[PDB]
Amino acid sequence: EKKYIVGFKQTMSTMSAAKKKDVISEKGGKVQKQFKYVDAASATLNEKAVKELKKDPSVAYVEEDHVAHAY
Amino acid sequence: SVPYGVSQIKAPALHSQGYTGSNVKVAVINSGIDSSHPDLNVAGGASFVPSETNPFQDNNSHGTHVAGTVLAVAPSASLYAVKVLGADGSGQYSWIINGIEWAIANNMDVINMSLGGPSGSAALKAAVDKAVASGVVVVAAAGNEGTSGSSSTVGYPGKYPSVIAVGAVDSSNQRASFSSVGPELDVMAPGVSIVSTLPGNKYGAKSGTAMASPHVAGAAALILSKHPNWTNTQVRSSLENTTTKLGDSFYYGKGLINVQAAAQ
Ligand code: NA
């Protein structure tokens, strides 16, 4: 539903934590946690933000932030 | 006192040789580790559950239990509570990423993930892949999904090519009925009626692939103590190659882990 992971393009597109954050907020997203090593961030996205963000030149992927459990 | 599964994996003969996991930093990426347990030595940690800030409080029980399996296998190992899961035993894939990421940052030798989900993540792949590229032995529970016809029932992260996906065997080498199957299945370790440490200065049997997983993260720590110069690549190949060979790789992977054979 609302919890997603936004994958970034780096030489296809995006680098800074401040650019990464603006790329989200530009499409009505709300940036959660900007990853250290992984070129991605957790974001709060409506259905509009998922489709707008899927088409952005700076975006590699928009995927749901899935639930894991202890086995 | 010493859990049976320790013996089954041939942990006791490695111990005698003098190898106990000395100088190995092991991340338990779980629900935390209970600080109140007089039998559990925590080297540090971090929490990634937004509402549960202390890695040292386990409101679940799973991470305390897992942690006690690691330290039974590898008693001289350095344990770290990486809290990724809340009270209900669930966390977000991002929270798991943030845990992996601290383990990369903290110069963790071995990651245990006694968890998963049904659905893939590109970000979950990037985080495991990077831990592996960084030289971390990445160990994960295969899942508790049984058999689903022809399909892989292997959860993520264990489903990833970079991770060592661990199914559960009982005391008689028989695959646990709950034990997730598939091509992504790497090794079997004891996962049936596992006595480990539980919250509130307790002991108790748990069953799950989450019980098999720590036996392999403890085995990687024991090899690393005998072969400090071995890469994650060498640690994994030796573990997969020196197994007590069981049936079909789809059900059993390579077989049961033999730490003594694996250690060289
Ligand atoms: Na795997």
Swiss-Prot record, chain A:
Top-rank taxon, per record: Bacteria
Biotechnology: Used as a detergent protease. Sold under the name Alcalase by Novozymes.
Propeptide: 1-71
Subcellular compartments: Secreted
Domain called Inhibitor I9: residue spans: 3-69
Job of this protein: Subtilisin is an extracellular alkaline serine protease, it catalyzes the hydrolysis of proteins and peptide amides. Has a high substrate specificity to fibrin.
Complex and partners: Monomer.
Protein family per UniProt: Belongs to the peptidase S8 family.
Misc. comment: Secretion of subtilisin is associated with onset of sporulation, and many mutations which block sporulation at early stages affect expression levels of subtilisin. However, subtilisin is not necessary for normal sporulation.
Protein name per its UniProtKB record: Subtilisin BPN'
Annotated source species: Bacillus amyloliquefaciens
